[PDB]
């Protein structure tokens, strides 16, 4: 059993919309720090404060505090505000105290759980820089070539100081997910002032630009990609207890054989508004179901050739997402319609995958009948499209 350590009202800055929203927050001794639209009447690692760095600031609002987290390879920040500096002090103190208690118990246990783990490869010059893939608040993602092997990777280069809080996340390659369609970490190293993550880069091209070229995917082809995405998100949800939050078509790549890769290239933005779930827009509470919304948008895009909700004006886009009922092309069939309307329920509690069953609900949906999920996981499904690359070093889809 987990104990509420401290609870109360806080103003929370929106993570996409940047208004201030009063929310009722519980800090628990397992490290969870979670906000609610109302004091709940009765656990995702996304909400953990363990391993955080705590900042006190006075901009844009007085008495604000920032929790900053490295989650896998991405820096995440949550910003809060209270009325009085005395209140801020009690909150930051409770948060620190909970975390310290987590560190102190982890290290005692692992100190005894040590079995010739008491033993004592790569640097920047090993790599050729090729292409900026993204920039963000605290770093950048670049396409590199490993000079010794000719192999291509994405390298994520982050400012060491925003992550580490006077001490110091290097054996992370040992915590790799055992899932084929997630992006695996190959190396992680640090420089004097940077922390670098070298991760796989699929060379079968961007699904965004395969879909653009082809206009639409058949229901069978979208079934294939959807099944692979579902397998990966099921793994994240149930083996890692984390939500992705970032499912969009541009984050989907194909490997040389045609299997999905979900990318891990996100950097801090302190946008793609068309993929945001309604509860994320309203900064209501969110959990595993936000990923099933994204699945719904991505597969609507695959089978219909356009977004379920779009407007060039972001404000009417948000209203469409929040308010408008989904329309389908007339040539779409009823198993696809049922899946998509279920994944795009606006109420996360009514959405397919939004119950205790999580991904099993989707896995059991009519649209996926006949899919052998063990074969999906094992890459025994035969891809409907093989990209035009010779080996894992044919740069067809970059150059």
């Amino acid at each position, epitope marked *: 059993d987990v104990a509420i350590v401290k609870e109360g009202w806080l103003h929370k800055r929106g993570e996409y919309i940047k208004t201030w929203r009063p929310r009722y927050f519980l800090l628990k001794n397992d490290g969870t720090f979670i906000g609610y639209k109302e004091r709940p009447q009765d656990p995702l690692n996304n909400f953990s404060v363990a391993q955080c760095q705590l900042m006190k600031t006075e901009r844009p609002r007085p008495n604000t505090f920032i929790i900053r987290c490295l989650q896998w390879t991405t820096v995440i920040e949550r910003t809060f505000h209270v009325e009085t500096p005395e209140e801020r002090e009690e909150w930051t103190t409770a948060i620190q105290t909970v975390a310290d208690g987590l560190k102190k118990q982890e290290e005692e246990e692992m*100190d005894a759980s040590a079995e010739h783990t*008491d033993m004592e490869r790569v640097t920047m010059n090993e790599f050729e820089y090729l292409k900026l893939l993204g920039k963000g608040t605290f770093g950048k993602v670049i396409l590199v070539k490993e000079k010794a092997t000719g192999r291509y990777y994405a390298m994520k280069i982050l400012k060491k100081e925003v992550i580490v809080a006077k*001490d110091e996340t290097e054996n992370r390659v040992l915590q790799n997910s055992r899932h084929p369609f997630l992006t695996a970490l190959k190396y992680s190293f640090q420089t004097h002032d940077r922390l670098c993550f070298v991760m796989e880069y699929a060379n079968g091209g961007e699904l965004f630009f395969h879909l653009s070229r082809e206009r639409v995917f058949s229901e069978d082809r979208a079934r294939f990609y959807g099944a692979e995405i579902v397998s990966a998100l099921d793994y994240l949800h149930s083996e890692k207890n984390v939500v992705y939050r970032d499912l969009k078509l541009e984050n989907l790549m194909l490997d040389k054989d045609g299997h999905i890769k979900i990318t891990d290239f996100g950097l801090c933005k302190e946008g793609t508004p068309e993929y945001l779930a309604p509860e994320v827009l309203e900064d209501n509470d969110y959990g595993r179901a936000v990923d099933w919304w994204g699945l719904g948008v991505v597969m609507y895009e695959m089978m219909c050739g356009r977004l379920p909700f779009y407007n060039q004006d972001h404000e009417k886009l948000f209203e469409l997402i929040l308010m408008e009922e989904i329309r389908f092309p007339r040539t779409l069939g009823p198993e696809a319609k049922s899946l998509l309307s279920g994944l795009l329920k606006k109420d996360p509690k009514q959405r397919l995958g939004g119950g205790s069953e999580d991904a099993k609900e989707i896995m059991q949906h009519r649209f996926f009948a006949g899919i052998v999920w063990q074969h999906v996981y094992e890459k025994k499904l035969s891809p409907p499209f093989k990209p035009q690359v010779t080996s894992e070093t044919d740069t067809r889809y970059f150059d």
Partner: nanobody
Amino acid sequence: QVQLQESGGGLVQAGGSLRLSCAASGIDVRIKTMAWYRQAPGKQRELLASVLVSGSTNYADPVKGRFTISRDNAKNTVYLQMNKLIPDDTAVYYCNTYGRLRRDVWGPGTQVTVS
């Protein structure tokens, strides 16, 4: 002052013997896998011996039979007993727990030179 402290070093003649002692101040060696290390003027730091919480011991090849790792829970101290010493054993010796090891935290070490 939470810290690990090594002593017992000095000059020894090859084929000699020495007992190194690691005095823990603010830590409990009972609850922690303890280990011994050494580092020579150009080499990497070397895992030498570890004593599990159970008392199980294990050694790296260059040392088995010759050195013995021992925990003494009553004194909160660990020991390296070094016998049949070799010039290639000359180095600075450290003792550590798992947590301090991965955070690169070290006591002062003790120098052992043999020829």
